[PDB]
């Protein structure tokens, strides 16, 4: 009752965030088991096949990694995994939580542990955009900050922060080292595909609006096939079914096709009728999250 964009608690994750230093270069790292994950650009600004050549010429002793106890960790090996640097530590994180490395799909939302100097100073939710970016809040030194969520006792790591793209847009890699949206860790002009409003989340938001109450709801329906045809030409992601949306549909008794039609109309001309106080779509509230907040 009452809907909010939740953030996952941070205790378990905070115990895994450390500081990583290389020749005056400072940022954050993720310590799980005896591995420390961090952006590879902690080595400097390179491109293409230059990384690796640089990593092979580096020494393990030059990697200054401190925990939040002030404990300096000794590095015993190093490798590149995509754009992610992995430093093996002599000692293993005795407080490694049950975790999993997951790649976030467009629309997926998770918690950003905004970190500086190995310390989490705050948290906020973000949603993986259609163009492989997230609308976050990061300043110099925040690189390496992680994105995650907690589901059924397991910590899911979806993101590691790498760079800022024009117009306050941020992007990075999943914990497997692959860059979202195919961007590269280089300071150069990079085309950013158009950002599409996330239909699935908009639908979730509409059901939340309904559950909380509509005169703005459309009675006519539009088919999924057609909506997606229309969505392709109007800046929206395609609609795809989910168990959560199904549950929401069952809870309200309102056909998801009417919400889709509602999106089509409101999109062309919103009018003076607000939805949950707004005159613009909220697309960062997920079906899963709305469902969780009903019961």
């Amino acid at each position: 009752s009452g809907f909010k964009k939740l953030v996952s608690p941070s205790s378990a994750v905070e115990k895994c965030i450390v500081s990583v230093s290389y020749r005056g270069n400072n940022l954050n790292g993720l310590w799980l088991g005896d591995s420390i994950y961090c952006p590879r650009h902690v080595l400097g600004k390179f491109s293409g096949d230059q990384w690796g050549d640089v990593l092979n010429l580096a020494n393990n002793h030059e990697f200054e990694v401190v925990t939040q106890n002030g404990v300096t960790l000794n590095v015993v090996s190093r490798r590149l995994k995509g754009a992610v640097l992995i430093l093996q530590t002599a000692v293993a994180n005795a407080e490694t939580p049950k975790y999993k490395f997951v790649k976030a799909n467009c629309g997926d939302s998770f918690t950003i542990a905004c970190s500086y100097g190995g310390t989490v100073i705050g948290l906020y939710p973000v949603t993986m955009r259609s163009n492989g970016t997230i609308r976050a809040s990061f300043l110099a030194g925040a690189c390496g900050s992680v994105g995650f969520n907690i589901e059924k006792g397991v910590v899911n790591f979806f993101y590691m922060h790498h760079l800022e793209l024009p117009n306050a847009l941020h992007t990075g890699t999943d914990l497997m080292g692959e860059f979202y949206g195919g961007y590269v860790d280089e300071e150069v002009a990079q085309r950013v595909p158009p950002d599409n409003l996330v239909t699935n989340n908009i639908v979730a938001w509409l059901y939340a609006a309904i559950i909380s109450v509509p005169k703005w709801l459309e009675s006519t329906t539009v088919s999924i096939e057609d909506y997606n045809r229309w969505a392709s030409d109007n800046g929206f992601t395609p609609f795809s079914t989910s168990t959560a949306i199904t549950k929401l549909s069952a809870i309200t008794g309102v056909d998801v096709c009417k919400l889709l039609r509602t999106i089509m109309v409101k999109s062309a001309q919103w009018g003076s009728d607000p939805i949950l106080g707004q005159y613009n779509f909220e697309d960062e509230l997920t079906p899963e999250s709305v469902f969780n907040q009903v019961g």
């Binding site: 952006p39 650009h41 600004k45 990061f138 300043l139 925040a142 690189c143 900050s145 922060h161 790498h162 760079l163 800022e164 793209l165 024009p166 941020h170 990075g172 961007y183 860790d185 280089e186 300071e187 150069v188 002009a189 990079q190």
Partner: peptide, 5 residues
């Protein structure tokens, strides 16, 4: 364009 944090 892009900037590394």
């Amino acid at each position: 364009x892009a900037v590394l944090x």
